[PDB]
Write a protein that binds this ligand. Structure first.
Ligand SMILES: *P(=O)(O)OCC(C)(C)[C@@H](O)C(=O)NCCC(=O)NCCS
Lengths: 82, 49, 895
């Protein structure tokens, strides 16, 4: 159950960062699509880093969006050191 | 002025549209007979599928 | 040899090299460039170049009121003085805020922060590539240039403390250089990405630079384009202080009623390359840019003023660059701004340059696209060239609007305006001018493209794909509408164009039928999403290794491979090779058995069916490989493993034929002693169910988690069948008179060892998975004892399939004449919760090319790469398919 919750948190944070404001793009973050294929840059990469670290209370590297390009890879990485 | 309104006509882009499906029932006044709009729109739905 | 004949050969070599070098010079300076594609979005509902042509030919005036969704205070900013404007209508792209962010990978955050110039330009470039017969996804890594004529119209307003929403992206999203850079970044192009700032001349200058870059070999292809959008109405307010805009907003080009110039938006792009490269690559040439020229005026009466001398000089330079006399061209797409100051100067320049020695019955026909859509701005010249291109294609010059009378400021008494449309010995040529306000005059000359079969493959699949299902439905509807307006297109050409010249996206669908009466309804049912018989749909997998599966018996039916023998020559050749291999170890020919020749044995006999199954399976697998589906693994089932052992390369054709033939011949005496029965239960349940019968019965094969075949003596088999009927278990007796994978085979054990004698096993080229051991097996280990164990020990198909799925394999292609193990494979796949997709090659009473192409299309829809060149052809006639159906969303910045 932990993996599903972590994937949900990552999807929510990625959708919030990906949107300028305010559902269509929430489902656009599937576990297989690479973050770079979603058009993520250094700025949104560090924003996801800060958001995920605040959610999990864990200091992550500043490139945790292309070292693990899929959201599922990010979930695996989070579950590793947690 | 917090309760003032009016109606306007916003221009919009010509939509791509779609194809006419099945049968469409066109009803016309007989006074017009075969003049302008009826024949032309009948043809338009004809080539629209 | 004499001295004369000796020096003659040296002279011949020297003059041949001289001709080669001179031709090199000619193609290195005066090379004709080919317009292989184009794409424009201009005001008036125009979305394609055909939209532009039907707009301009019909004489439609595409000027309407100001947009209301852009936040402008349109009711307040109109005043027919201090900071207002006296025009309430111009050419606008009301869908300029519409952009498919997801398709290009762009985020909504970046998209709204990004300039609509870039947003329009990306889609225009993608459509321009698609309309050229090129797959943009295949352009990645090529030395393709990008030359965009754009300008910083101002969408984020860097001088005004850029908004909080577009924070961080107001450099990347708004630098004019990034307008050209983003095309190459998204498409992966390698040629230079240069944006040009030249006001009302940037796009034609970009075309010039692209031509020079291609002539020097710096690029293979190039994108020459321009874009203009109006985030704010300042362009109307600043130009309203001076009476430069027309009072009503109509650009009365070269007319006596010329009183101003209304601005307009629009994007317009061309995909171009060298004419020789286009001919070599077999791209369709729309037109030929022969020459180009650019210069300045400098000594103009004011900075923002024209100069007839400079315009004449650039026109003459462009003519000389193309090596064409002035009388060669019979049309000009003049700038035609509509200004009182600009029009007489431009008309005088055109009259002095072009019309001075023309015949007395072929005046130069001058027109302007600005009369229809207004002044496009940066994208003016690259839209005018599109207009002239379609004028040459359709052989008719469209009329230029709002010319009540030719303007009296110039002495026309050589050159005439296009008041009404005019129709058209020598190739058609036409000039285009993009004179700018910064003094940078530009001019290009275009020429009509020079004048440029195979048998139709039956049941050619029609392939469609899109990023999302809604986009796929839109693609289907667009294709249906396009095909409706076409007089009897060739279906194989459409199949080739769809398969090769369009990207394979995620959500895919296919139409496989051999009659031109069902494709239309199938396209419709795809459009509204209803199902159809000849329609296939699926979601392609991003990654996954391919498997070939070779079941044992059961996948037989009379006439299998008969149609393929005539229709498919590759299958015929493979069957012939199998027959030649089999002839020495059997007393009949494979072709007679398959074709049902008189006197040949039927499939009832065990010794003839198994070699026939082996040959058919091997030929089908080799046909799959010939079509480009190279397996990453192979798995078998009893005798099928022998066929797998051939495809893996461990066993030669002769050795596999020997093994299968002698094994079946040694299995002949077992006929009538026992048989098999397939019951749907777990392995443990079947095992404990066979306990009372003991050694009489045994687990023949564990096909799946709820499908097991038990073999044994006929009496015990009937007893177990009665017991299952009492217990209500769906037990089915297979049509076989021989109890393989049972103790009875021990009676023939030594003979089996004779069957495999003399073979020469080799290591596997493709990883082969043994169903006996349950994991990969070395190729050299396939010895006689292994084959005896295969005939004797229980098949463990379920375990090896689970292991193979554990190894990342995701596609299971059954190379049978009819699927027999697809049920068990799908049962295992859903049991283990994997996303693997199973497919088969042929089906019962279905073995023609239509079923083969159906299987291939199903495999492609599941995501397996297929070499459609082999299936369809190397090169068919080009076909103009509709571009991608983008699913756009509004993206605009609010204050
Ligand atoms: P992230 O890597 O996407 O962004 C971080 C960065 C702003 C440091 C990066 O975009 C960057 O500047 N990379 C180097 C670019 C460069 O060296 N020259 C371009 C002209 S300054």
């Amino acid at each position: 159950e932990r993996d599903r919750a972590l994937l949900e948190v990552v999807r929510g944070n990625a959708a919030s960062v990906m949107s300028h404001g305010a559902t269509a793009t929430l489902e656009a973050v599937e576990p297989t699509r690479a973050f770079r294929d979603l058009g993520f840059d250094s700025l949104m990469a560090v924003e996801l880093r800060n958001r995920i670290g605040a959610a999990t209370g864990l200091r992550l590297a500043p490139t945790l969006v292309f070292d693990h390009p899929t959201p599922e890879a990010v979930v695996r990485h989070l579950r590793a050191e947690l | 002025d917090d309760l003032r309104y009016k109606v306007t006509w916003k221009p919009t882009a010509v939509a791509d549209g779609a194809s006419a499906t099945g049968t469409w029932l066109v009803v016309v006044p007989e006074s017009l007979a075969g003049g302008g709009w009826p024949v032309v729109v009948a043809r338009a739905v004809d080539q629209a599928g | 040899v004499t001295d004369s004949e000796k020096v003659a050969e040296y002279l011949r070599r020297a003059t041949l090299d001289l001709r080669a070098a001179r031709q090199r010079i000619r193609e290195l300076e005066s090379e004709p460039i080919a317009i292989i594609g184009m794409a424009c979005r201009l005001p008036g509902g125009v979305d394609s170049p055909e939209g532009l042509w039907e707009l301009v030919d019909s004489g439609t005036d595409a000027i309407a009121g100001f947009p209301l969704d852009r936040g402008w205070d349109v009711e307040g900013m109109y005043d027919p003085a201090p900071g207002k404007t006296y025009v309430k209508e111009a050419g606008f792209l009301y869908d300029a805020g519409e952009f498919d962010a997801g398709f290009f990978g762009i985020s909504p955050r970046e998209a709204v922060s990004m300039d609509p110039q870039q947003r329009l330009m990306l889609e225009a470039s993608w459509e321009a590539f698609e309309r050229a017969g090129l797959d943009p996804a295949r352009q990645r890594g090529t030395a393709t240039g990008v030359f965009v004529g754009a300008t910083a119209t101002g969408y984020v307003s860097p001088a005004a403390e850029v908004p909080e929403g577009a924070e961080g992206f107001a450099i990347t999203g708004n630098m004019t250089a990034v307008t050209s850079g983003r095309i190459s970044y998204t498409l992966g192009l390698q040629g230079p990405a240069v944006t040009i700032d030249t006001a009302c001349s940037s796009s034609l200058v970009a075309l010039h630079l692209a031509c020079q870059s291609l002539r020097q070999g710096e690029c293979t292809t190039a994108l020459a384009g321009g874009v203009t959008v109006m985030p704010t109405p300042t362009a109307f307010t600043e130009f309203s202080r001076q009476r430069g805009l027309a009072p009503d907003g109509r650009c009365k080009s070269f007319a006596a009623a010329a009183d101003g110039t209304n601005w307009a938006e629009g994007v317009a792009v061309l995909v171009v390359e060298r004419l020789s490269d286009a001919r070599r690559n077999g791209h369709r040439v729309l037109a030929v840019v022969r020459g180009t020229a650019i210069n300045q005026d400098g000594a103009s009466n004011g900075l923002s003023a024209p100069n007839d001398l400079a315009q004449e000089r650039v026109i003459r330079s462009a003519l000389d660059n193309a090596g064409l006399t002035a009388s060669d061209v019979d049309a000009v797409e003049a700038h035609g701004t509509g200004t009182t100051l600009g029009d007489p100067i431009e008309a005088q320049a055109l009259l002095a340059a072009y019309g001075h020695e023309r015949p007395a019955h072929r005046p130069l026909r001058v027109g302007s696209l600005k009369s229809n859509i207004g002044h496009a701005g940066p994208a003016a010249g690259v839209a005018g060239v599109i207009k002239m291109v379609m004028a040459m294609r359709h052989g008719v010059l469209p009329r230029s609007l709002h010319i009540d009378e030719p303007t009296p400021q110039v002495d026309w008494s050589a050159v005439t305006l296009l008041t009404e449309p005019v129709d058209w010995d020598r190739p058609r040529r036409a000039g285009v001018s993009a004179f700018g306000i910064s003094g940078t005059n530009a001019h290009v000359i275009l020429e009509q493209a020079p004048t440029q079969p195979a048998p139709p493959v039956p049941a050619a699949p029609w392939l469609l794909s899109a990023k999302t299902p809604a986009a796929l439905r839109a693609q289907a509807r667009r294709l249906h509408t396009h095909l409706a307006r076409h007089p009897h297109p060739d279906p194989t050409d459409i199949a080739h164009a769809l398969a090769t010249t369009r990207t394979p996206h995620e959500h895919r669908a296919a139409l496989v039928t051999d009659d031109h009466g069902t494709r239309g309804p199938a396209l419709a049912a795809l459009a509204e999403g209803a199902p159809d018989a000849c329609l296939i749909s699926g979601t392609a997998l991003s990654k996954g290794r391919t498997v070939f599966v070779f079941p044992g018996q059961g996948s037989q039916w009379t006439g299998m491979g008969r149609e393929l023998l005539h229709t498919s020559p590759e299958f015929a050749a493979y069957i012939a090779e199998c027959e030649t291999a089999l002839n020495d170890f059997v007393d009949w020919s494979l072709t007679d058995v398959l074709r049902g020749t008189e006197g040949a044995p039927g499939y009832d006999r065990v010794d003839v069916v198994q070699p026939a199954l082996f040959a058919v399976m091997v030929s089908l697998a080799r046909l799959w490989q010939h079509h480009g589906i190279h397996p990453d693994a192979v798995i078998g089932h009893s005798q099928g493993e022998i066929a797998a052992a051939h495809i893996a390369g461990a066993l030669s054709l002769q050795d596999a034929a020997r093994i299968v033939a002698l094994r079946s011949q040694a299995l002949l005496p077992l006929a009538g002693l026992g048989g098999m029965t397939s019951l749907a239960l777990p392995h443990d349940q079947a095992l404990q169910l066979i306990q009372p019968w003991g050694q009489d019965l045994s687990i023949a094969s564990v096909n799946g988690p709820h499908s097991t075949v038990v073999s044994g003596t006929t009496h015990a088999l009937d007893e177990l069948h009665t017991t299952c009927d009492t217990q209500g278990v769906r037990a089915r007796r297979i049509p076989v008179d021989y109890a393989s994978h049972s103790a009875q085979v021990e009676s023939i054990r030594d003979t089996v060892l004779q069957a495999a004698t003399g073979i020469n096993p080799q290591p596997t080229t493709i990883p082969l998975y043994s169903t006996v051991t349950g994991q990969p097996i070395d190729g050299t280990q396939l010895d006689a004892d292994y084959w005896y164990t295969n005939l004797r020990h229980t098949v463990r198909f379920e375990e090896t399939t689970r292991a193979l799925l554990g190894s990342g394999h995701r596609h299971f292609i059954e190379t049978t004449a009819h699927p027999v193990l697809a049920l068990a494979l799908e049962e295992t796949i859903e049991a283990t919760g994997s996303d693997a997709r199973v497919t088969g090659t042929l089906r019962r009473d279905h073995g023609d090319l239509t079923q083969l192409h159906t299987a291939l299309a199903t495999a492609w829809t599941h995501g397996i790469d297929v070499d459609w060149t082999a299936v369809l052809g190397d090169r068919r006639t080009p076909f103009e398919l509709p571009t991608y159906a983008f699913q756009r969303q509004r993206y605009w910045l609010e204050p």
